[PDB]
UniProtKB/TrEMBL annotation, chain B:
Binding site for Mn(2+) 1: E155, E157, E227, E234
Official protein name in the record: Glutamine synthetase
An annotated Gene Ontology molecular function: glutamine synthetase activity
Binding site for ADP: K46, R222, F237, H286, S288, R361, P369
GS catalytic domain boundaries: 132-488
Residues the record lists as binding Mg(2+) 2: E155, E234
Organism: Pseudomonas lactis
Length: 488, 488
C-alpha cells in the first residue's frame, strides 16, 4: 500500500510509537470498529467508521473523504458550488484524513468501538486550509515560537432534557436547505434553585452515566453542578494544554450528547433553547500562559498587580480583538441572546477583577498559580478549535504589540468602552472591517470562506424571522430552535 | 494551601482528611458532594471528582454567594450586580468552600458518591458572616466558654406521599420570583389513628428503605412512628451534641427526601401542606446542658423541683426570647398555621411539666439523666443551625440573667402569659423591636440581612393572598404550597 504519511512526513516519532500502541490495544480489547473523525466548521464531528483492517491501511495511506461538509451549512444549503481552489472556493476535491494516533479513545457507550481524530490534507500533502484543528495547530505553534504554552480550563453549561419524540416521521425530515423538526423534549427537573444538591441527585440516574463515560475517556472531569435554570447543568474540567484541550472539549461535547441519546435523553449546547424557562448557557474560557521550559504560570501577579505585565498585555489583546473574534467565540445566531446587560454575560470590551459583568474577568492573587483570565464571551456551541485559537491569537497579538487593557472597570455595565456585537451579522461586520490579524493567523482563504458561509446563514435567519427578531432580548425564534437544538 | 495558610483545620480535621481520602480510594468512589446549608437550611454546593476533592483539601472550592441573595423562588432580594459588604449587602463576591472532613459520609442511595459539608470563608480567610453553620459554631463556642455542651434529641415529623406528577412541563417551571408548580402527590395511608402499628407495616416497603439509609449513614436512629394525621410520620434519634447534632438534622432531612424521591415518593417537612386531611407537623427540640468536664446532665432536678436551678433559668431564657426567636424556630409563613390553641402546639410563652399544650415542656424525674426541656415551638422546615443556635442563645441568656420562667401552667391554653406571634410578619416585628440578644450572638450583619430577606418574602405572600389569609386557623393557601412543598 502507498505510504502517504511517511512520504509527506505527517507523523512524528511520538505519533508512530502511539500508532503501534493503538493497534496493540485494538487487538488486546477485541475492538471491531474505529471511528475516524474531524470537526467541521461548526465543531461537529464528521468522518467514517472503519474496521480494524481498514484502520491498519489508513495508518499508511490515510482515508479519502470529500470536502462536502465544509461547503454545506447546518441544514445542507449549498453555499459553495460543489459542481464547478483558494481563489474560487468551489468544487468537491478529495482530501485525505490522516489519523492522529495520539488522540485514540475507546468509546464506553458503544459496542467494541474505538475513536480517533484525523487531520485533513490535500493529496499533494499540504494541510487543507479550512480544517479548524489545523488553525488551532497554527495558533499553538505561533505561541510555542514565542516561548509559551496555552493552559485552558473548560467550563461548559448545557441543557439535559428527556426525549419525547425524535421527529423521525418523513414529514419532519426537512430537505437540503430546509430545517427538519426539532426533537421534542421534556425538562428533567425544576430550577431557579441554584446549586441545589437535591437537583444533582434527581438527575443522577443519567448524569452518573455521563460522569462515568467522561471519566472512562480519561477526561479530567472536575465538577458537576446544578445551574440556575430548570434542567441547566454545568460541567467543569481541570486545566489542559493547547490542541489536547481543544480535542478534549470536542470529545466532551460529543460524549455528553451520545451518552444522553443512548439512554433516551437529549443534551444540547445550544445557547438558549426555545423552551419556556430556559436561560442562556455560556462557555467561559479560563486561560493562562506557562513558560515552555520552566512550566511556570507567567500570569501570576506580584503585590500591587492584578496580573503580570505579560498577562496584562494578553488581556489587552483579548479586549482589542473581542469584536473581530466574536463570530468565532459566538458563532450561532442564538448565542447573541447573551449580549445584554445585567446578565453576568458581557455586552462590552471591558476587563475587571472578579466582576462577572466583564468580558475579561481576572481571577488572581499574588503568587497563586490559579491566577488566570476568564473570557466570559463564548457560547457552549462554539467550535472548540476556533474559540481557543481566537483566544491564543488575540492574546498573543496583545503581547507582541504591547496592548494596554486600560483601567479595570468597577461597573462593567456602565463602562465607557466599546460595545460588543449584538448580532451575528454585527460580529461578521466587525471581522470584515478589522480582518488583518485573523487573516494573518487563520489564513486569508479561511476568512473569505467563513465570511461567505456565515453571511449566508444570517440571510436565511433574516428571511425566516425578520430583522426585529434579532434583538438580543427578544424571544428565541423557531428558526434558532430548528437550526441548533438537535445538532449542537 | 488556603486551609493551612489560614489555620482552618484542627489536627483532628487533618487526620480525618487522611482517612477520608483513604476511604474514597478503598471504596472506589467517583464523586464527592461538597455542600453547605443556605439561609433556608437547603443544601447547596457542587459535586466534585476525586482529583478535584484532593485539590479542594488544599485550596478549597470557589463558589458564588448567589443563593444567600435569592429567596426560595430566586427573587433577587439583594442586588447581585452592584459591587459593595456588611453595610451594603449587595454584590456577588466569590467565597471559598472549605471542606470539613469530619462530616464525610457515603450516600447509600447514590452511585459511588461521598458527601461532605463545607464552611464558607472570604478569600481573606475570615468566616463568611451569613453562613448559618458558622452561627451555630459561634453559639456552641459561646456555650462552651461557660463550661457547657448542648445535648439535643432530634424529633422530626414529616409527610410521606407518593408522586403522581413531578410538574416538569415547561409551563410549570415558573421563573425568577415566580413559584413553579407544586409536585402532585397521593397519600400513602389513612390516619387519625395515632401510633397504629398496622400503619407502620402498611408503609414499610418504602419506610424500610428510609430506615436502612439512615442506619447506613451511621445516624443514631431511635424510632419510627405513625403520627396522628394520614401519611404523617415521625422519626426520632438518640441524643447528639452541638454542631454534630445540627449537621445530623440537616443530613437526616436531606437523606429522607432523596431516598423517597429515588423510589417515586415525596417527603416533605413543610409544616402543613395544602392537602385535605393533613394536620400540621412539628419539630420539638429536646435539649439538655451537660458539664464540659464531668459530662453530667446539669438539668437533673432534685426532689421538689422539676429542673435544677440552672435548667429553670435556661427555660426562663427560652420563654423570654421565644417571640424574638420565632422567625428562626418557625421561619416559614406556613409554620404559623401551628400558632393556635387546642392543637398540641404552643400559642403562648408558657412552661409546664409534661403538658403538650405548653411551649416549654419539662420531662424529668428526680435523679433522672433523661431530664430535659422540650421546646415544642419549632417547625420541621426550620434551618437546623438557626433553630438550635436560637435555643442555645435563649437558654444561655436565661442562665446569665437568672431569668425566672414563673409558675408551671396546668392549663397552658388558659395561661396569663405573653402570646406568641401568629404570623411571620409578627415574628419579624418581635425580632426587630427586640434584637439586641440575637444581634450580639448571630451578628448585626446577619440580623440586618435576615430581616430584609424575610420581610421581602412576607410581602410576596401578602400581595398574593392578602392579609386576611394569614389567620392561623385559615385554610392553607396555594402560595404556601407553591413556596414550600417541593423544596422543604
Ligand atoms: N492557571 C489557570 N489557567 C487556566 N485555567 C485555570 C487555571 N487555574 C484554574 N483554572 C480553571 O478555571 C476554572 C474555574 O472555573 P469555576 O470553578 O467554574 O469558577 P469560575 O469559573 O471562576 N466562576 P463562575 O462563572 O461563576 O462559574 C476550572 O476550569 C479550572 O481548571
Ligand atoms: N438528656 C436529654 N437531653 C436531650 N434530649 C434527650 C435527653 N434524653 C432524651 N432525649 C431525647 O428526647 C427525645 C424524646 O422524644 P420522644 O420519645 O418522641 O418524646 P416525647 O417528648 O414523649 N414526644 P411526643 O409524645 O411526640 O410529644 C429523643 O430524641 C431522645 O433522644
Ligand atoms: Mg463555574
Ligand atoms: Mg414524639
Ligand atoms: Mn455557570
Ligand atoms: Mn465561569
Ligand atoms: Mn409527635
Ligand atoms: Mn415531642
Amino acid at each position: 500500500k502507498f505510504d502517504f504519511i511517511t512520504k509527506n512526513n505527517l507523523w512524528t516519532n511520538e505519533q508512530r510509537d502511539a500508532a503501534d500502541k493503538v493497534l496493540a490495544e485494538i487487538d488486546s480489547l477485541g475492538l471491531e470498529m474505529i471511528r475516524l473523525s474531524w470537526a467541521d466548521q461548526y465543531g461537529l464531528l464528521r468522518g467514517k467508521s472503519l474496521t480494524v483492517a481498514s484502520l491498519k491501511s489508513a495508518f499508511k495511506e490515510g482515508s479519502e473523504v470529500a470536502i462536502g461538509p465544509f461547503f454545506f451549512d447546518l441544514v445542507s444549503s449549498m453555499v459553495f458550488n460543489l459542481f464547478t481552489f483558494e481563489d474560487e472556493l468551489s468544487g468537491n476535491p478529495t482530501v485525505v484524513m490522516v489519523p492522529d494516533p495520539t488522540t485514540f479513545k475507546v468509546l464506553p457507550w458503544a459496542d467494541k468501538t474505538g475513536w480517533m481524530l484525523a487531520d485533513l490534507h490535500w493529496k499533494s500533502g499540504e494541510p487543507f486550509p479550512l480544517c479548524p484543528r489545523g488553525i488551532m495547530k497554527k495558533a499553538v505553534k505561533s505561541l510555542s515560537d514565542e516561548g509559551y504554552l496555552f493552559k485552558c480550563g473548560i467550563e461548559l453549561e448545557w441543557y439535559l432534557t428527556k426525549i419525547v419524540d425524535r421527529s423521525l416521521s418523513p414529514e419532519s425530515l426537512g430537505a437540503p436547505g430546509v430545517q427538519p423538526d426539532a426533537i421534542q423534549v421534556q425538562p428533567v427537573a425544576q430550577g431557579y434553585s441554584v446549586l441545589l444538591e437535591h437537583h444533582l441527585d434527581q438527575v443522577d440516574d443519567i448524569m452518573s452515566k455521563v460522569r462515568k463515560g467522561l471519566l472512562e475517556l480519561n477526561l479530567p472531569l472536575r465538577s458537576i453542578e446544578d445551574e440556575w435554570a430548570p434542567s441547566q447543568m454545568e460541567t467543569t474540567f481541570d486545566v489542559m494544554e493547547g490542541l489536547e484541550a481543544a480535542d478534549a472539549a470536542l470529545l466532551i461535547k460529543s460524549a455528553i450528547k451520545q451518552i444522553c441519546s443512548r439512554h433516551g435523553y437529549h443534551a444540547t449546547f445550544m445557547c438558549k433553547p426555545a423552551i419556556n424557562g430556559f436561560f442562556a448557557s455560556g462557555w467561559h474560557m479560563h486561560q493562562s500562559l506557562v513558560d515552555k521550559d520552566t512550566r511556570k504560570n507567567l500570569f501570576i501577579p506580584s503585590e500591587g498587580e492584578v496580573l503580570s505585565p505579560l498577562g496584562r498585555a494578553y488581556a489587552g489583546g483579548l479586549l482589542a480583538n473581542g469584536s473581530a473574534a466574536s463570530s468565532f467565540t459566538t458563532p450561532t445566531v442564538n448565542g447573541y441572546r447573551r449580549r445584554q446587560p445585567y446578565s453576568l454575560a458581557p455586552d462590552r470590551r471591558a476587563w475587571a477583577k472578579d466582576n462577572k459583568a466583564a468580558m475579561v474577568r481576572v481571577v488572581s492573587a499574588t503568587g497563586d498559580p490559579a491566577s488566570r483570565i476568564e473570557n466570559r464571551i463564548g457560547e457552549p456551541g462554539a467550535n472548540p478549535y476556533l474559540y481557543m485559537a481566537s483566544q491564543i491569537v488575540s492574546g498573543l497579538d496583545g503581547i507582541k504589540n504591547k496592548k494596554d487593557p486600560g483601567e479595570l472597570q468597577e461597573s462593567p455595565y456602565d463602562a465607557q468602552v466599546p460595545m460588543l456585537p449584538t448580532t451575528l451579522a454585527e460580529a461578521l461586520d466587525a471581522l470584515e472591517h478589522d480582518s488583518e490579524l485573523f487573516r494573518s493567523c487563520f489564513g486569508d482563504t479561511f476568512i473569505k470562506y467563513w465570511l461567505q458561509l456565515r453571511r449566508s446563514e444570517w440571510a436565511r435567519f433574516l428571511d425566516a424571522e425578520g430583522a426585529e427578531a434579532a434583538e438580543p432580548t427578544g424571544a428565541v425564534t423557531q428558526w434558532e430552535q430548528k437550526e441548533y437544538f438537535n445538532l449542537l
